Amino acid sequence: MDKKTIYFISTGNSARSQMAEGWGKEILGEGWNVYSAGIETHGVNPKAIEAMKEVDIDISNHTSDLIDNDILKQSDLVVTLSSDADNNCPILPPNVKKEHWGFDDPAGKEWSEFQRVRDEIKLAIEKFKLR
């Protein structure tokens, strides 16, 4: 069937949203275009890159972006990863569905927290695929 589009939006496009994009392309790649953005943009967190590298997923080529309206309007599903993203997300046109999957912000925390959030996001995406 026609490939769908999922857009992960978080406070920034530095950690949670980048790991979601990484997992999304790996798990949902066959039937989904996967993108990510932040309400704010502050570079990709090197620890998020390393966290994904540890599970053989390369996100070193990702970029930190604000929301692209063109992609947004053509998205089938928008997933917010933080309450700030949930609240600051633009009013979505009727053709776009929206869900909130919250995760803790690993910024400034110890290494194991990046691993923890990485794997919680992995689980959420694996469950999503089973719908």
Ligand X SMILES: [O-][Cl+3]([O-])([O-])[O-]
**Torsion of the alpha carbons at 127, 123, 25 and 43, rounded to the nearest 10:** 140
Contact footprint for ligand X (CB under 6 A): 10-17, 38, 82, 105
The answer to whether 33 touches 70, Cβ cutoff 8 Å, is: no
Order of strands across the sheet with 77-80? 32-38, 4-10, 77-80, 97-100
Q: Does 31 bind Cl ion (CB under 5 A)?
A: yes
Q: Does 56 bind Cl ion (CB under 5 A)?
A: no
11-19, 23-31, 89-97, 107-115 -> range binding Cl ion (CB under 5 A)? 23-31
Closest separation in Å from C-beta 48 to ligand X: 7
Closest separation in Å from C-beta 29 to Cl ion: 7
Instruction: Please report, as residue ranges, which positions from 49 to 68 form the binding site for K ion (by CB under 5 A).
Output: 65
| Residue 28 Cα distances to 33, 122, 129, angstroms | 8, 11, 7
Residues near Cl ion, by CB under 5 A: 28, 30-31
